Design a protein around this ligand. Structure first.
Ligand SMILES: [K+]
Ligand SMILES: [K+]
Ligand SMILES: [Mg+2]
Ligand SMILES: [Mg+2]
Ligand SMILES: [Mg+2]
Ligand SMILES: [Mg+2]
Ligand SMILES: [Mg+2]
Ligand SMILES: [Mg+2]
Ligand SMILES: [Mg+2]
Ligand SMILES: [Mg+2]
Ligand SMILES: [Mg+2]
Ligand SMILES: [Mg+2]
Ligand SMILES: [Mg+2]
Ligand SMILES: [Mg+2]
Lengths: 845, 781
DNA sequence: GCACGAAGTAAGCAATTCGTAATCATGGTGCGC
DNA sequence: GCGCACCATGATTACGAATTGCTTACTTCGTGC
DNA sequence: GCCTGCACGAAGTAAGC
DNA sequence: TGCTTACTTCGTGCAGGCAT
DNA sequence: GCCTGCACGAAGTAAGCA
DNA sequence: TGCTTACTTCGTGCAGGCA
């Protein structure tokens, strides 16, 4: 059977204190139950706001009384809930705390504290603090307040409840600047819609387990429990408010019972007196317990696919708390329900499934881990030296210890550049991987770099936004850490003002590179106005697209407006700003302007005949320069060859006068002779190569004078260096001492992207020779083609953007086939193609 | 092997009509299912009032379409639900009606109508009208509207739903003056707390079965179904409103579906389009059906003690309707669940338990009765000649027919003075015992007295309050019936005004006896002011207790105030009204005044020294005068001439010689009771004059009998347990299926008979009581 | 416009560590003296 | 028949690539005459 | 079980033997 | 001139309904 | 973790001076 | 013929959302 028990190890005075506290808590929870009973019995009372306020007041007082249990945090020992010893686990948490209060936040956890206090004064001495729907506080924060015994924070009347502890719970979290991870961010996004969303609903909607959403009740974990724990431990203990609450709550409780007796007369023949409620405790609870059991067995049968018989048995066994079931060891589940399948238990208890179907553990080994650490997130929240201590003392088996260690390491070895040694040293230095990730988000860059082996790659992989800041020239480690701590992240540092960034010791070039305002500061003289434009509009391209009038409004010059939109000199001098800007934004290029508009249209728009001819293509200028073929006739001449000088010298002059309306036949041969006269000069200048000195100039531009002359002295001349660059001879370029990847990537475009994908310089060289540019690799290359070049499937998945489809234990070829048929990677219909939707549904994101 | 089937016997045009109506109902119920799906899936949607309004609108439209099924009430025949032919039963109801609509109010009853109409346009063409929790109407009234096909009454919009059909359902019942019996009165008491209380919850709280709470869907039965049927049939059919609803509902349904598609975007990635809902009907229903099955199997395991396997099998077989399980014959339960015990089936199906453990029926005979009449209340709702016709046609076996007959008669033979012959004649004259009791409640005294054998005792036992009115001198049968029909009951006749009672032809002495205002009319000159005081305060003793100032206000005289409180002449002349009245109400008697007060205190209160000190066998003619006073001169001289003298008559009276007093010709019970005090009460308890004589000799007064005598003591005197329960004031505790010994043990353990009704339910189960009797006495919870 | 820094980054280099392909462990399955 | 040959899958080896630090050797920026 | 409604003996006050 | 029938005024109480 | 939208310099082709 | 601004179209990579 299930074991609920605990023993009292305090003094007799403390014994009387704890008994009085627990009995007042039972009185308060009786009130909770009686108010819900009245709500269920009368349809009029179900709508009464007074009765709901009374119900929430009872919840508040129950929480206050619960917080005062085990104040010295030592009056109880060997607290057992459903057969799990909480004493050992609470000690291993970073914040420690009382095992009594830690137990009472579980379903029917009061049964241990009740036995420890030899309580028999009531029928069911129940105390519960898991209220959700009608709770006047945010439920998780309520439970965490009880776990940490905060009587100062537990309000004793509904009016005293602050909005930052209820619907505006987000305000209280932001007040204390607590590091929040991605999972907690998605959970908060759900909770902002409805703070009273039940936790299993968040788990279902986010595709996590209940254990993943809640987390460990300690600031060093991940989940809503861990998040509130982080927030609460940073709240200083307000002793005066605690004493005031203790003074008020007893007299308040008697007032609530009298208010209920007064209110029950409005709806019943027999008023709900305290005597009546004590003499009917089983009548009140029975309905609520029955609906609990029904909903629990339904969730087990529906969402977890457990047989109706087994699901109903388990709902009966654990008072219908699916949170407690999914954290119960397999042996105990089989003890209370012998027909349970191991597969069903692995279905409901996802920690057991992870320990078996990934770490190949025995059911008993996984039971060890579940009894000691409850969940995987509980293992991650436990210090590594604590696990080694448990293993040395013989309290943990070898298989369980090895599995827990590999679980701890895997949380960090997944990071790029961190292996077993660096993860080992990080865990030694900071205890558990959750704390490591916490220090990473808090931007403790120097604190992390002090560990042996934490270099540039590890910092770029761990500290968010460190890679973006440290890559900027002039910004060193200390400046990056200072900025990230001052503003709160790379995104917040990028949004900072120019003046305050100058105050931090940033050059105008550094700020210009950070914000990307070089193009904007090429127009406006200063950086402040460019940054303000980036604030208002958000993108320089949007500022370019802005109409001429709105650009003139709050603008500086019309020549500046023409420089912004890239208006040609001919187009800006031939027309006004409005018409020229409209033409440029409608056609794009001056050649398209000359092609799709007629000469008469250009004249009507107010262009000089010579200027209107210059707006037209240079073919027009050549035609009129040779023998004045005419502004009216040169257009019809260019209308046949589609504005192409090559097709003009091809066909016979007889075929030329055929298409054009009117053409002199003697002139028809003088224009073909002039067309052939220029295709000999277009070809003479088209096939041209630059000089050796010009290659030297480009090399000095790209890699500086020193490395350029080193390359020139190594090979023949700068012409040979350019020949090797155009052929993508990365291997030969790297042979030169003093030439590395930061020079080759600056010489050969696209080498940096290929090296970032994990490609050997020889592999990047082969790829660049095969496809010629990374853009053509990403769109054109196929996985089999890349395997012909000798690339591993990991590099192929990296370079083709198919990392999502491979992360679900799937191959790269069939992954590319989906990106081939449909447009994107994101695109029931899969059963038509014959796919197992299991992984697609499993990985949500 | 459950049989859900029905055959169509209308025309092809009518066939298309019925098919179109059924398909529109399926559309509406799909809307219901989809709104429920959204509500169960999201906790935020569970609180969305807009989604609830949409859901209730869908429910309303489903009900409206359901009412229009089988309007000619002849388009279907051989309607089979779970293997029961409803055609035969609906015909035997007083109001008849459509077997199609009668079937559709059952769980998965649409499966018979769906087969009758060859419906295949949807995956599960389900139409259900049993909604309870979220139903915008009172659920039982909703179902009774559908069963009677009242399309005029089914609202089509939540805003058009009248309060008299929802939270104020009591108004609609009172509007039509429908006779309500005690079981229906307790059911109404529960429903006033929560009109949407599910019927099995009412069954638990009242300690009844579900069939007892529901009753037959017909005005001549007992239960909430029967009550609403009584109320609905008295509502005239508003044809124009029905046509208006038929006009509106199609476009309203299309607007509801558009509103659902718009609202579903707030909660889902794929909006709930009609196409999506039709192409996913099994996914939507899958969750809801499983929750129904779980609740049903759980209730079967806990409240009925059925094995988990068998309970889950029964819940799955009948789609989780415990009302349907308790009305299913044993053969069907064993067919769908072969491991079911006969004892488990008798636990869940209380009609089967009654037919076996009381009428010694075979399981097959009880199954016969359950197939034909569903429940005991269904047997009581069927005419007796209908049952005899069924027996003559061979449709009912010998054992089943005899059991049904004994059940019908027992409903009337239990009344005092009604035996087998009189019950037989009453059933012949009015068809079924429910109709007999109904006419009794309707105060149809002349209609009942027309039956051969219906005399004074039978009328006093049947017509409520007839015994109280007819006992008043001068009030005959016709006047009693007139008053009971004019005011609505003996209590209402007592509350009537004096002027309107005088207009009916009542003497002032008759009204004074009825209202009990003789003491009040001895103070006030007229009857109207005494009646107004009885209205204001309710009791003459309450008027006596009134303070001196409130009695003086709107009062007449101070001497009258002193006469009311019974103030002695010495106490009223020695002090004023205030102090004397306070002393009299604090001490009671002048002797206590003189004992507990000092002479100096009396002087200080303003009393004269002399007054304060004072405050501090017969002959033959003499006995003959008393005899002339008690029984008149004639009977007195008759008694004197029969015996020795008036002294001998007095000697026999003091010894309670009732037997010898009754020997005298011309001397009856009304004379002996006026001579021997307490004889009237003992005769009214059903005691032989010899038995009353023995009791009066043994204890000396009825007051000392009621407090001192024990049931064994009275059984030593030779009294039947019925007479013992009558005479000891335990008639309440015995009428609740308890014996007289345990009734006296309850009056002994707990203080009074009233004090047993406020005891803990745990201590009553400790005494070995069933929740039926516990609910009769106090009531769960 | 160019001297002339003034920090700051690119490159090298040895030792260590990462990390993924190569191989080993292990449990089946099929062709032959 | 009893061994070995060839797979098949997951686990573990193993060795080339990347990383960690530390130290020069140039490289943009950027003032001032 | 409260409530209406006479009964009746007790007892203090007077007329009559 | 002092003891009896006689007769109100209390004070207490049972009986008979009716309602649960 | 993909994806659109920028930033921004690269680069191939010609007029403008030189 | 040759050295610069001048207009065109990419191609290279970083960042910010969103599921
Ligand atoms: K290293
Ligand atoms: K190996
Ligand atoms: Mg403290
Ligand atoms: Mg050891
Ligand atoms: Mg890694
Ligand atoms: Mg630590
Ligand atoms: Mg370091
Ligand atoms: Mg930098
Ligand atoms: Mg090199
Ligand atoms: Mg026959
Ligand atoms: Mg009888
Ligand atoms: Mg009839
Ligand atoms: Mg008669
Ligand atoms: Mg009469």
């Amino acid at each position: 059977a299930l074991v609920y028990d605990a023993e009292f190890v305090g003094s007799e005075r403390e014994f009387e204190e704890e008994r009085e506290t627990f009995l007042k808590g039972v009185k308060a929870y009786d009130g909770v139950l009686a108010t819900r009973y009245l709500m269920e019995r009368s349809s009029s009372a179900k709508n009464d706001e007074e009765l709901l306020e009374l119900h929430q007041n009872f919840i508040l007082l129950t929480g206050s009384y619960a917080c005062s249990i085990d104040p010295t945090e030592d009056r109880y020992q060997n607290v057992i809930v459903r057969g799990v010893n909480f004493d050992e686990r609470v000690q291993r948490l970073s914040t420690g705390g009382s095992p009594a209060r830690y137990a009472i936040v579980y379903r029917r956890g009061w049964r241990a504290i009740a036995k420890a206090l030899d309580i028999d004064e009531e029928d069911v001495p129940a105390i519960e603090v898991r209220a959700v729907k009608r709770n006047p506080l945010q439920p998780a924060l309520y439970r965490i307040l009880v776990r940490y015994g905060r009587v100062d924070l537990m309000p004793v009347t509904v009016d005293e409840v602050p909005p930052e502890m209820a619907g505006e719970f987000e305000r209280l979290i932001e007040r204390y600047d607590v590091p929040i991870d991605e999972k907690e961010e998605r959970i908060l996004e759900i909770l902002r819609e409805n703070p009273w969303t039940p936790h299993d609903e968040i788990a279902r909607r986010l595709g996590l387990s209940v254990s993943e959403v809640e987390g460990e009740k300690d600031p060093e974990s991940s989940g809503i429990y861990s998040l509130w724990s982080r927030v609460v431990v940073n709240i200083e203990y307000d002793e005066r408010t605690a004493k005031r609450h203790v003074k008020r709550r007893d007299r308040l409780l008697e007032e609530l019972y009298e208010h209920l007796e007064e209110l029950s007369e409005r709806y019943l023949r027999h008023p709900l007196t305290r005597r009546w409620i004590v003499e009917h405790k089983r009548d009140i609870m029975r309905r609520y317990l029955e609906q609990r059991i029904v909903e629990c067995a339904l969730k087990l049968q529906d969402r977890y696919g457990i047989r109706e018989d087994v699901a109903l048995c388990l709902a009966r066994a654990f008072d219908g708390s699916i949170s407690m079931i999914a954290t119960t060891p397999y042996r105990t589940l089989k003890d209370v329900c012998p027909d349970l399948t191991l597969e069903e238990a692995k279905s409901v208890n996802r920690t057991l499934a992870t320990l078996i179907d990934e770490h190949g553990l025995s059911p008993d080994a996984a039971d060890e881990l579940i009894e000691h650490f409850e969940s995987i997130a509980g293992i991650l929240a436990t210090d590594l030296e604590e696990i080694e201590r448990m293993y040395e003392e013989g309290r943990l088996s070898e298989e369980a210890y090895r599995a827990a260690v590999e679980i701890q390491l895997a949380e960090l070895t997944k990071k790029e550049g961190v292996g077993r040694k660096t993860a080992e040293r990080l865990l030694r230095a900071f205890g558990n991987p959750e704390r490591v990730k916490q220090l990473a988000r808090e931007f403790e860059i120097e604190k992390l770099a002090s560990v042996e082996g934490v270099g540039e790659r590890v910092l770029r992989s761990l500290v968010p936004g460190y890679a973006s800041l440290i890559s900027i020239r002039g910004i060193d480690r200390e400046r990056a850490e200072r900025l990230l701590k001052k503003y709160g992240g790379y995104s917040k540092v990028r949004e900072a003002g120019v003046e305050e960034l100058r105050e931090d010791g940033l050059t105008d070039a550094q700020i210009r590179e950070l914000k990307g305002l070089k193009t904007l500061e090429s127009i406006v003289g200063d950086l402040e106005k460019a940054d303000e434009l980036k604030r208002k509009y958000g993108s320089a391209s949007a500022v370019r697209r802005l109409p001429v009038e709105e650009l003139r409004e709050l603008g500086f010059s019309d020549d500046e407006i023409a420089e912004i939109k890239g208006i040609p000199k001919k187009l800006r001098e031939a027309f006004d700003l409005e018409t020229a800007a409209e033409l440029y934004e409608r056609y794009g290029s001056l050649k398209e302007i000359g092609r799709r508009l007629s000469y008469d249209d250009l004249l009507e728009l107010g262009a000089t005949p010579k200027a209107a001819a210059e707006i037209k293509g240079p073919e027009f200028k050549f035609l009129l320069n040779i023998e004045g073929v005419g502004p009216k006739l040169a257009e019809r001449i260019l209308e046949a060859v589609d504005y192409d000088l090559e097709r003009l010298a091809s066909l016979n002059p007889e075929e030329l006068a055929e298409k054009v309306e009117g053409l002199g036949e003697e002139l028809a041969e003088r224009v073909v002779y002039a067309a052939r006269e220029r295709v000999e000069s277009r070809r003479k200048s088209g096939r041209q190569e630059r000089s050796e000195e010009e290659w030297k100039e480009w090399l000095e531009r790209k890699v500086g004078e020193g490395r350029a002359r080193r390359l020139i002295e190594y090979f023949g001349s700068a012409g040979e260096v350019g020949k090797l660059v155009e052929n993508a001879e990365v291997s030969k370029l790297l042979e030169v001492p003093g030439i590395g990847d930061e020079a080759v990537a600056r010489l050969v475009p696209g080498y940096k992207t290929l090296r970032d994908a994990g490609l050997t310089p020889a592999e990047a060289e082969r790829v660049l020779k095969r496809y010629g540019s990374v853009s053509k690799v990403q769109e054109g290359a196929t996985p089999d083609e890349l395997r012909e070049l000798g690339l591993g499937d990991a590099k192929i998945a990296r370079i083709l953007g198919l990392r999502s489809l491979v992360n679900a234990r799937l191959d790269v070829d069939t992954a590319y086939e989906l990106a081939r048929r449909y447009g994107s990677v994101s695109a029931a219909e899969l059963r038509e193609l014959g796919l197992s939707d299991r992984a697609i549904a499993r990985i949500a994101g």
